[PDB]
Every structure is written in C-alpha cells, then in structure tokens.
Amino acid sequence: PAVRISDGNLIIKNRTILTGVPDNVITTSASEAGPVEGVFVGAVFNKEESKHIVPIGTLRNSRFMSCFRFKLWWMAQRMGEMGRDIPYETQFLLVESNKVYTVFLPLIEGSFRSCLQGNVNDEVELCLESGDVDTKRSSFTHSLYIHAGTDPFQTITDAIRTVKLHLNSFRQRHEKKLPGIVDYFGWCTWDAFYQEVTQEGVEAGLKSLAAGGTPPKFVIIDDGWQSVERDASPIFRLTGIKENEKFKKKDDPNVGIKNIVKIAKEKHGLRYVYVWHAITGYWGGVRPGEEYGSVMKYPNMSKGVVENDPTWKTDVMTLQGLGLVSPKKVYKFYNELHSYLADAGVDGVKVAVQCVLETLGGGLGGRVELTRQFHQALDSSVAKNFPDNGCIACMSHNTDALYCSKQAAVIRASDDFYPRDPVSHTIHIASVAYNSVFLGEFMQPDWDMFHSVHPAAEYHASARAISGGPLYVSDSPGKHNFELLRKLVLPDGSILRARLPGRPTRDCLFADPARDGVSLLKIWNMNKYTGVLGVYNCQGAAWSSTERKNIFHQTKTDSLTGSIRGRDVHSISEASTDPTTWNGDCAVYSQSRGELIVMPYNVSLPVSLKIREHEIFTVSPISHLVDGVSFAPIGLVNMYNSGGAIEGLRYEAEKMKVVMEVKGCGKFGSYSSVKPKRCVVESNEIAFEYDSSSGLVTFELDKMPIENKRFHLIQVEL
Numbered sequence: 001p002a003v004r005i006s007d008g009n010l011i012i013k014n015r016t017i018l019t020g021v022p023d024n025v026i027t028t029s030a031s032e033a034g035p036v037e038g039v040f041v042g043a044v045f046n047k048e049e050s051k052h053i054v055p056i057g058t059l060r061n062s063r064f065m066s067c068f069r070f071k072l073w074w075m076a077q078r079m080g081e082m083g084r085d086i087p088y089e090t091q092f093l094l095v096e097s098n099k100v101y102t103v104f105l106p107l108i109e110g111s112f113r114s115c116l117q118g119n120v121n122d123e124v125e126l127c128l129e130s131g132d133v134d135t136k137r138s139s140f141t142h143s144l145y146i147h148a149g150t151d152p153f154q155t156i157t158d159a160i161r162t163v164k165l166h167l168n169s170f171r172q173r174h175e176k177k178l179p180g181i182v183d184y185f186g187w188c189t190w191d192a193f194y195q196e197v198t199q200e201g202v203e204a205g206l207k208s209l210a211a212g213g214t215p216p217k218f219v220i221i222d223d224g225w226q227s228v229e230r231d232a233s234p235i236f237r238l239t240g241i242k243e244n245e246k247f248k249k250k251d252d253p254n255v256g257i258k259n260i261v262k263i264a265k266e267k268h269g270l271r272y273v274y275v276w277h278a279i280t281g282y283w284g285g286v287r288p289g290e291e292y293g294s295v296m297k298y299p300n301m302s303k304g305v306v307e308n309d310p311t312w313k314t315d316v317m318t319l320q321g322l323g324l325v326s327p328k329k330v331y332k333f334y335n336e337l338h339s340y341l342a343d344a345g346v347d348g349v350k351v352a353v354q355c356v357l358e359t360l361g362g363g364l365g366g367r368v369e370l371t372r373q374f375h376q377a378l379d380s381s382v383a384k385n386f387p388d389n390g391c392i393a394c395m396s397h398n399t400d401a402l403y404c405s406k407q408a409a410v411i412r413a414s415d416d417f418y419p420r421d422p423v424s425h426t427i428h429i430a431s432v433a434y435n436s437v438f439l440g441e442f443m444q445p446d447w448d449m450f451h452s453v454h455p456a457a458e459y460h461a462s463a464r465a466i467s468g469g470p471l472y473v474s475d476s477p478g479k480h481n482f483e484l485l486r487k488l489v490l491p492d493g494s495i496l497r498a499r500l501p502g503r504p505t506r507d508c509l510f511a512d513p514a515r516d517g518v519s520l521l522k523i524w525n526m527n528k529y530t531g532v533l534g535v536y537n538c539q540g541a542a543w544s545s546t547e548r549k550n551i552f553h554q555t556k557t558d559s560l561t562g563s564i565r566g567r568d569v570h571s572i573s574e575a576s577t578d579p580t581t582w583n584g585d586c587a588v589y590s591q592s593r594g595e596l597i598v599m600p601y602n603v604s605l606p607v608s609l610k611i612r613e614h615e616i617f618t619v620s621p622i623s624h625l626v627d628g629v630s631f632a633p634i635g636l637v638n639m640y641n642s643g644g645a646i647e648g649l650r651y652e653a654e655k656m657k658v659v660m661e662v663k664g665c666g667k668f669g670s671y672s673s674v675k676p677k678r679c680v681v682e683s684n685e686i687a688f689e690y691d692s693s694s695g696l697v698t699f700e701l702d703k704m705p706i707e708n709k710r711f712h713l714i715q716v717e718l
Ligand SMILES: OC[C@H]1O[C@H](OC[C@@H]2O[C@H](O[C@]3(CO)O[C@H](CO)[C@H](O)[C@@H]3O)[C@H](O)[C@@H](O)[C@@H]2O)[C@@H](O)[C@H](O)[C@@H]1O
Pocket: 071, 073, 074, 190, 222, 223, 352, 394, 395, 412, 415, 416
C-alpha cells in the first residue's frame, strides 16, 4: 500500500521507520469511507484494563518533531532523532525519513484517549486511557493513525481529514465560521488589572487606546467579573451566573454587566464584547448545590501529565477540588449563564480551564465521554446565545477536546503571555508556531495578548501580525506605543489578518530553534496576493526535560545567521495571478529595514539576528508583463503584514496596466522594474516616488477608503 507492517517493521515508501513492532499491534485500512491511504493502528491485550502502554516499535535515526503537553493545559515543541527523546504526553508526531513525511495521530477511540511517549529503549509507546477505572477495554482498532506524503503540511491536512471522516466528531479549521473579532483589533483586561478588573477599569482602557488613533473594536473582560466565594490560598467557586459588585453600576445595582457593555458599544464604538469563564464555571467550579447538580470532585492524576508537570500534583484545584456541575444539568448551566450574558449584549466567551474535564472522569464515563458531554452543551449554548460563533478556547490542548471540536473556531495556541517573566518571550514565539502546525488543523490559532510597551513588544507584535489570528493587547491604560500599534491596526480598528495559521517553514519543522543553538525560527503565512515571512531568534530558553519548567540555558554565539528564500513561504504560488507561467521570482520587502530586493527563485538572502531580534518580510510573486516590465505589489509598507491590504489584483499586459483593490490607508509600496508613467487612485492621478535602483514605487493613500465602498481602486500604468 504505502504504509505497511511486514516482518516486525513499520515501513513507509520503502524506508524502515520502526523496528520491532510487537505481534499484538494490528493495522487496518478500513474506515466506513472506506479504503484509506495510510493506516489505523491499535492492539489487543490479554486483560480488560482501564489503561495500557504498548510499544509500537523502535524509533532510531529519523528526525522527528513533536507537540507534547508540558502542562495539562498546554503543549510545546520537542525535536529528536531517537525514541527516548519523545516526551510523555506527545499528542502529535511528525517524522522525516531522508523528501518523505509521516504523521502519527494518537486518537480518541470510544471512551479511550491515546497519546504517544518514549522509553529509554527507543520504543514509541502508545498510551491508551479511559481516565475512569470503571470504563475498561481489551482491544483497539483505530487508536493511532499513521500517514505519509511528500509535502509535510498537505500530509498533515490529509491525515486530519481522514481521521475526521472516521470519527465525524469534528470539523477542520477551514470549514468553521470564524467570529468577527478576528478582523478587528482588541483589548483584553487580564494583564491590565488581573482579577481586580472593574467596569471603570474597562472604560479607561477602551478610552486611552481610542485616543491614540488605534481603537479596539472588541474587548475581552477577563477573569475577575464573576460572583465568587471561598468556602467558610483557598480556592474560589462560582456563586452566581451574574456579575459581581464591580460590574453593577454604582447607583442602580439591579443593572449589571449590561452597563459596561453599553458604555463600550454605544459610547466607545466597540462591535464585540467578550467575557471569560471556566468550562466548569470558575477555578473551583460551581458551589455545590442542587441547582446545577454541583458536587465536589478531585482531579485524578494521570501518569504522563504528572510526569511533565510535577506541580500539578499539589495544585489548588487538585487538593481543594472543584464543584463539577452535573452532565444532566450542564446545558442548563451554560444556557442560563450565556442567556444572561447575551441578553445583556455580550457577543462571546473565552472558555478557559478546559482540560480539567479529563481529570474529572470520575465515575461519569471517563475523560472522553465527559469532555464530549460538556463540549456538546457548550456548543449548543454558544450557537444559541452567541451566534457569530463567539467561543475562544483556552487551556484546551488535549486531543479529547480537539477531536470533538465541531463548532468552536478559535484556540489559544500556547501558555500565556507573561509580561514579567523574561524567560517566556522566545518560548512563546516558538510554542505558538509549532503548536499551530497541528492546532491550526482544527481551529484558527490565537497567539494571545501582549504589551505595546515592553522590551519584547515589537517581537510579539510582529508575530501577532503574521499569526492568522486575532490581534489584541492587554495594555494597562495610558501605557501604549501607538507608533507600534499603527503597524498593526488601521484608523477604524481593522487589521491586516493573514489567511492561514502562522507556521514554521519546511526548513524549520525538524530543527528546534529554541534549543539547537544553530537555526533561526522562520514563520510563514499567506495573504491573497503575497506571502509573508517572519524570522525570529528564539534561542536560549525552553522547557527543561530535567527541571520540568521553562528555564534559560546556554547559547554559544550571540548572533545567528540563516537565510531567506521566496519558496520558504510554502504556498507562495497561490499569490501568483498566473501560477502556470510563474518562474518563482519574488519581490521581497524588508519591513523593518525599508529595503526592496528582487529574489530570483533558488537565490538565498542572508539574515542575522541576536536573541530576541526579528525581521518581517513581505514576499510577492513577480509578474512578467512584457520583457523588461515586471511588477509585484507589497502593500502598506509601514505595516507588519503589508500584503494584507491587497484585496484585488489584476494584470493587463495588453495595455501595460496594473489594477489593484487596496484596503486601508498609509504608504503604499510596489516593485516595478520601470518607472511608472502614472499612478491613479479613484480615477485621479497622484504623486508617487520611485527608486530606480530597487524598483520601489511609493505613494500615499491619505484617508481610509471613503464609504461604505470598501477598497481603494488603484491603477498603475507602466
Ligand atoms: O485566570 C485568567 C487567565 O486564565 C488562563 O490561564 C491562566 C492559567 O493559570 C496558571 O498560571 C498562573 C499560575 O499561578 O495562574 C494565574 C492565571 O490565572 C497566573 O497569571 C499565573 O501565570 C497556569 O500556570 C497557566 O499555565 C494557565 O495558562 C489564561 O489563558 C488567560 O490569559 C486568562 O486571562
């Protein structure tokens, strides 16, 4: 077929990937769909137990990259050559045999959830768990899926499709409705006030940002608005669905969060208002009580999580427990909550603490069946009450939840932005890129909030710009960098969102740019008519396998050199108006240096960077109109994702004309191999500059497109 087991070996296009597959491991190419290009894998065991480890075979001398849970809530990256290097809790694994790429998807099957892990003998072990000592099983047929192909990202997509067609319990990213917040700049209260947020806090924040010319059009009222109590650092539990004191106008206390929602929308011009809540109500769940059938439960410890995060064994939540709402009443709980919120004008929720459900499998059906039931009810309640699909999933990097991700369309792709922890910044940019390789198959990644005023602001902000996801800050009011923010946000609060999850280049997939001391991390994305490439140095910090937390670690040179090729933007062909006849030549524009460079296909351009430095490049395919006349739009050169502005593009070779639809305002740049005769913006000739040495054509779009008539129409005549 292409992937087979014969002898005791796993073979993929005649390369031996695994040796010593034990005889009880069985393959099958049947879903109901039904023949299938890769292979499903499970095993038969002697006894009917609620857990199994089972070697799959022995990995040696094949580069792999993995996404593995280093906390319960979150994944990050790990590269190796050998089985022993594969961490506990590995949820996805990609393997390069050297040309050919292979993906391993441990899956949910019935009431069980797989992940991978390695042992010291270099075996890849599958780990099946029901997370409920009463749900037990002896055989498994479809608990890992393996599939190969020649394009690493296409390989991943095809494999997720195939898993989707087996399970029918989720939708791929591209098939879900994104909520409208992804198109606008936002503000999150969380880093501004933490749990001490108030409604006066909210207003001040929306005011200062609008003052500086970059207005948020959404806001996330983060953890802090809910009514909660300790029992009587002890844990808080939800006492009501309605807002605490800080969100009732100080005058008519019967008016609640409706007040701040109105202030934000009518007074400060926001389109969307989102609020935070745990999947379980609050951190300690809901106060035990017959209303929602709430009952104290204690997180069960699974071996792999505890192995990577030892501190989870003594977390507030583990030791003090949570009031878990009953599955029978969980819809009721979310509907009552969300109906209150929505009928107050709230458009969406940011749903945190999602992974706990896996630990509360209790006597309730297990990790998979309880995660399902809660997610089914959350969705129903979201589709009823926030029907722009206003769900942001946070702290949910388990396959329990990803494989029943049917509706929700936006996922935080890492652990939090930490303004005060200097260790975190490089790790953030790496965890976000690597997890988006796999998380972006399901939901649109969210690179999380950041500070415009921070030593690492431009580092974080460039990443946000090229992430594909919502762009927001969590600034405290008045502490803003609007020179910075205008590179991301147009006068009306819109952004230049790229189309895909921001991901590492083919080049970077198997080299760990946090740990190897040698490579720069290159992130790629696409717009309609350009690509875009971020280059970062994210070296010298990472999750330690020994210390089991984020540490700094030693780094040899200060400055690393890599290189950039147009083809590093993996899908750059899609931006060409004529892919059949395109030679591969790209206009590359260094957004930070201000320089335009023509890059023939093949040709490299070196890039040097110290730790925490970055460079963003817009990559536009060059169109050859006639011999000597070549063109490629850049977009808005003083914005990070400059190419996000070009909504339309057409070449008229017969008349020597480029016609463009450009959104936004500010300086517009293009590469032209000859000086233009004219540039025209809405039927009016305009002033432009040309640098004959580089090709750079430049003029000013002075104002936002007028109307109600969304784009500037620009003709360039050559
Ligand atoms: O609480 C609001 C915040 O929750 C989401 O997750 C934060 C999570 O909490 C843990 O971080 C710490 C540990 O003490 O708890 C608070 C956050 O409540 C601190 O900021 C600490 O860093 C945990 O270690 C984290 O891994 C976890 O992400 C977060 O996604 C949202 O930002 C939300 O505002």
